Amino acid sequence: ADAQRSHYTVYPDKHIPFVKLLSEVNVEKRWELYHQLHSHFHDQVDHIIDNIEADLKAEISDLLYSETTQKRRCFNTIFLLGSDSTTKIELKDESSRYNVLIELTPKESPNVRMMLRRSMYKLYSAADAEYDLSLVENFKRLFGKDLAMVFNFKDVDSINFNTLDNFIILLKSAFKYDHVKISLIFNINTNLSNIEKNLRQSTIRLLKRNYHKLDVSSNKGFKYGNQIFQSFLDTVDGKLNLSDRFVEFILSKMANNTNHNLQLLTKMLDYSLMSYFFQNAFSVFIDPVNVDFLNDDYLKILSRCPTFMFFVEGLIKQHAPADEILSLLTNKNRGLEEFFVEFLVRENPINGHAKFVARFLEEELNITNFNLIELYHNLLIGKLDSYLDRWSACKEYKDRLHFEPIDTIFQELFTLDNRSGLLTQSIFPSYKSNIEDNLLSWEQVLPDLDKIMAPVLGQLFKLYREANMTINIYDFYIAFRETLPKEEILNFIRKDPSNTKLLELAETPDAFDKVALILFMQAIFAFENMGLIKFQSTKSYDLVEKCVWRGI
Amino acid sequence: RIPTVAPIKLWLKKDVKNVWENLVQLDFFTEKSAVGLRDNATAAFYASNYQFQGTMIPFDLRSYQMQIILQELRRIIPKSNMYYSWTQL
Amino acid sequence: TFEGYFDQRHTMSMAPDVTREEFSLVSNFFNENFQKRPRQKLFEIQKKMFPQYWFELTQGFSLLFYGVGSKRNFLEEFAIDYLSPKIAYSQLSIPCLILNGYNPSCNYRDVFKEITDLLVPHVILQIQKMIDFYKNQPLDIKLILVVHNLDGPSIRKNTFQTMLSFLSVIRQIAIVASTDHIYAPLLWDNMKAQNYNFVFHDISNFEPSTVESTFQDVMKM
Amino acid sequence: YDEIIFRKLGSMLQTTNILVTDDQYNIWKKR
Amino acid sequence: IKLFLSTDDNLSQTYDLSIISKYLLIASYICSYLEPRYDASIFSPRYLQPSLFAIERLLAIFQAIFPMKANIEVFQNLSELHTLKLIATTMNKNIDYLSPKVRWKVNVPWEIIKEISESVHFNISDYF
């Protein structure tokens, strides 16, 4: 057996991760086009992410090093609202001052005694890389350089505010020295006022004398989200279209997160992009040079486009010259191939108008407080007039920018939409609901006691659905036992006489109840592992408590 | 009880926090089960290791008990004080 | 519904006693004859999903496995027989690190030691250094990190979750995990979910969980 | 059975009902 | 004058939260200050510290008050709230949420729950 060990390591055609459609060269072409577009998008994604990261550090350094005329000595306070432990800061290498970054996590601050010791330990380690306040006092006489300390409180909301409040007062004594300067960085997840309730008002007055306030959230006025979404519009080049349904799904799943919406947006867009090229065969015709790849199945799929049905029925109901209809009915000369080529030739000014409205709002009207996704969906639906009427200045230019989208035939083959729920089951699962349904509707998973005896966990969940909040374990065991087909169980058991212990146990008169109890014990342990139940074993194994219910 | 005229501040709950902090330090109040100064170093060690709930729960919900009973206040508080009339129930 | 929750002196000794051997007898004899063939057919059908998981792993997504039944064999087979050999020989020697989270004594320092030894030429600081190192490094995958029972007793703790969550930032590390608790998604907040970047699939298989229950005895009843 | 497990499993191989089925054109062809 | 009318010792839509988070925080306050006796009747001690409760109650009340089932976003918002420390637990070190011994309580005052209810158009004022 190998599972006893906590952890262990095991060591070991050129499969391009795509797979055939319609039950060789086409797959490679599709993969290459997909990868080209995918890398083109991720180039902009990484560029924008790096720009975002580079943006904050300039302001952070400016706040840290903007010397201000003050004769009195006090902490330099910076409030990073909406921040997180993932941020980083680098320090200037000044001439006469030695700079040390002192990180302070809540795990490193159980009491003031540990805090001072660890701060001095880090300070000494940095100084020797080139355990009390005497080290600060004697720092210049040791290393000949002035000391500047930056205490980075990585997560304020989890620190015991009593210990921090006392430690700030402890550091307050350090200002007796002329060669020491201190700066404090606060990382706050909630609003600023959450700190004001927990710290004592003496410490707040110390902090308030020299403090700066900064928001570092990614949701700052839709700026970066709009930029990323417009970059996605750019990187497609009109080679693929986004339906109203998919934009609706994005709008529905974006608002539930409020810190890292950009990451979720990028995840959803990337997943849709990778799904499209694996699903649709016509993604090959993003490159029209391969026009000779048209085949029977492509023609069938084109015939399956509802727009084709609308066009053909419009011709028929008008009693148009029957030769054109017979040409497709008899499938002769396939002029529909050139028809589809001309369809590919078509241009979509929808993207251009969507870009230009945003550019006009930003540059001509200076209206930056808007969502680009809402604008795009309003353009898709055509209610753009009301959306622009949300703002007072957009009347004349709203009338000018009025745009009307027009569909094209076989556009369904070049549109991404949420139509089968695959995009929801994979990123936003109904985890607990799925488990409940699979326990109750196990035929949704599984394809002669096998044919009757349902899985033990589902059978036990049957009783779990109805019973009381606190369950007498004996009653639950009785209820589980009553479901057993004893004779069919004996027939199942007697198929393996090769094991003597099997017959020895089974032929015992107590065997039915013993097997029922063993299965009950295993199922109850599994339920405890899943969080379904909890024993009262601290009192007795006579009662068990339910910890989950259906539907909620 | 002051009649209204035909055509005293209730201080804000945030400002009262400083007054509460002042009174908690001057030992007029005390936490529900505050042992206070421990007797020996080992007791201080076990006390500093443990984290009391009273230091974690919000400033507005910490339970306190009183050191000067209202009767003592009525003995001490001058009758010329405006709030003296409330030294009775 | 919520109404089904708002509207909801015997002893264990009244049932016959069970010995340790008898407990194993049923679990061994039934599971080899009960639902073996239909679950084998279901496994053969489900094996067709490996290319999609492989593609998602290439694109930088972590994979989380959930559902009723044991999830050891599926993850082990995917990691060993399918994933690593393709990672190696389609790019032209991938360490398949398997972590048993259901062990209640899996020290995080020991796992971090192995990871550092296998990837590197205050654990969080070292992980940050690794992340900064591998940003400019080539994107080809080096390590597969199979985390069984990402809701296990050694794993539920906040520090170990924080340690694991930063690992998925490195593209050259493949993370595969499985959970059993109903409220498993409660473990991960915004930052941890962001760094994990899971893609969720329902792998409910009704495989009899026996290895997980081995570490903690059931004979207590 | 294949479609249900494909959709529950989140597989992209499940048919998406944006295009109407070929069996529908076994009916519509007679029109 | 306005300098002498406010203390100005303060260090500085106060909470901007997702709708799911807002309703979860409404339901948690209901759990923390409504006696367990009334869960079977109303849905079918402000000055005191909040009482403890269980997640099973919170999920049921949230399902009963939101204008949702058990998708991962609900639990993600709940864990975000715990990380934001808008909801507290009965432990200090080595948080083990999944362990059955942990219990939950509200760490938010009434003055903020009222504004959240106004922003989501809910009527907590009528349940007490």
Residue numbers in the entry:
A (entry chain C): 16 to 27, 36 to 46, 51 to 157, 183 to 499, 512 to 616
B (entry chain D): 425 to 431, 448 to 529
C (entry chain B): 242 to 249, 260 to 343, 357 to 385, 399 to 498
D (entry chain F): 394 to 424
E (entry chain E): 289 to 300, 320 to 351, 373 to 395, 414 to 474
Reproduce passages from the article.
The MCM motor of the eukaryotic replicative helicase is loaded as a double hexamer onto DNA by the Origin Recognition Complex (ORC), Cdc6, and Cdt1. ATP binding supports formation of the ORC-Cdc6-Cdt1-MCM (OCCM) helicase-recruitment complex where ORC-Cdc6 and one MCM hexamer form two juxtaposed rings around duplex DNA. MCM is a ring-shaped helicase containing six related AAA+ ATPase polypeptides featuring bipartite active sites with catalytic residues contributed by neighbouring subunits.
Cryo-EM density for all subunits of the ATPγS-OCCM complex could be recognised in OCCMMcm2RA, however, the topologically closed ORC-Cdc6 ring transitions to a notched state, while the notched MCM ring becomes topologically closed. Moreover, cryo-EM density for Cdc6 in OCCMMcm2RA becomes fragmented, reflecting increased flexibility. As a result, duplex DNA appears merely clamped by ORC-Cdc6, and not fully encircled by a protein ring, as observed in ATPγS-OCCM22. The Mcm2RA N-terminal B domain transitions from partially plugging the MCM central channel (ATPγS-OCCM state) to a retracted configuration that creates the space for full access of the double helix into the MCM pore. In fact, continuous cryo-EM density for duplex DNA can be observed spanning the entire length of the MCM ring, unlike ATPγS-OCCM where the double helix is only seen encircled by the ATPase tier. In OCCMMcm2RA, Mcm7 disengages from the ATPase spiral and from DNA, while Mcm2 forms new contacts with the double helix. Within the MCM ATPase, four sites are occupied in ATPγS-OCCM, while all active sites are nucleotide-bound in the six MCM subunits of OCCMMcm2RA.
